[PDB]
Design a binder for this molecule. Structure first.
Ligand SMILES: [Cl-]
Ligand SMILES: [Cl-]
Ligand SMILES: [Cl-]
Length: 265
């Protein structure tokens, strides 16, 4: 079996929040022919004086996964999940909040900005590594990014390039508001992060980070988009599929061309 730490809430209080995520995991399970054993971990147990107790549980997993979530609850714990993954070379996959915590984690623990956060969780941080873009904001609020958008894979040696069968542009679906702060790209790069996919291949102030990786590690990938929004039993989301492959310690034959479900029509 393949042990994946699912860092968020217990089954009892998750409701139907992870329905589509778990569907996608099931698609991957079938395509790889592996017995998935998800450990549902309460993210709040990964913070505070006793958190080493919870960290030890993550160290026994084959993979560590951080999905999208709501509110600021367990943000520090999700950051700590990304830290364990980065420091122990345990495959990591983050989706939307999962990417943001990878960025925050790295900013605190490698870049050395102890107060690094998203603008969402600490308005008074002097290192808002995740923030609302100026073009998305006004005095009363900001855009809620939904729907499809072109994703430019800009690193040819990346996990993204490989799992999307070397397509330069793919189309994924979104539900987010805050983006990686463009002013800190060099700092993140110096700390080992590879910006592998973006909305704008020129890297302007309007460049929205769609995927980050850590190529020093076997598998560390996190995406802004929600790959579970495009996944079927016969065409599983490549991001989830590659994560589960890595956790299972298995290879996979990627098609010669990216599926039409994730290409521009
Ligand atoms: Cl949570
Ligand atoms: Cl891979
Ligand atoms: Cl967001």
């Amino acid at each position: 079996t393949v042990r994946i730490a699912f860092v968020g809430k217990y089954l009892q209080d998750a409701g139907d929040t992870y329905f589509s995520v778990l569907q996608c995991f099931e698609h991957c399970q079938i395509a790889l022919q592996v017995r998935l054993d998800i450990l549902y971990v309460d993210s709040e147990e990964l913070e505070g004086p006793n958190a080493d107790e919870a960290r030890k549980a993550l160290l026994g997993c084959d993979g560590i996964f951080v999905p999208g979530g709501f509110g600021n609850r367990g943000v520090d714990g999700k950051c700590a999940a990304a830290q364990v993954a980065r420091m122990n070379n345990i495959p990591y996959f983050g989706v939307c909040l999962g990417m943001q915590v990878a960025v925050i984690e790295l900013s605190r623990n490698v870049v050395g900005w102890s107060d690094a956060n998203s603008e969402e969780f600490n308005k008074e941080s002097t290192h808002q590594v995740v923030r609302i873009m100026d073009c998305d904001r006004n005095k009363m609020g900001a855009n809620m990014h939904l729907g499809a958008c072109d994703v430019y894979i800009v690193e040819k040696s990346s996990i993204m390039a490989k799992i999307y069968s070397k397509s330069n542009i793919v189309v994924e679906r979104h539900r987010h508001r805050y983006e990686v702060n463009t002013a800190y790209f060099e700092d993140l790069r110096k700390a080992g992060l590879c910006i592998s996919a973006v909305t704008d291949p020129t890297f302007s102030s309007r460049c929205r980070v769609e995927a980050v990786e850590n190529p020093s590690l076997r598998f560390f990938l996190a995406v802004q988009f929600h790959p579970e929004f495009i996944s079927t039993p016969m065409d599983p989301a490549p991001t989830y599929l590659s994560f589960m492959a890595a956790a299972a310690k298995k290879d996979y034959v990627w098609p010669q061309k990216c599926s039409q479900r994730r290409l521009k029509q």
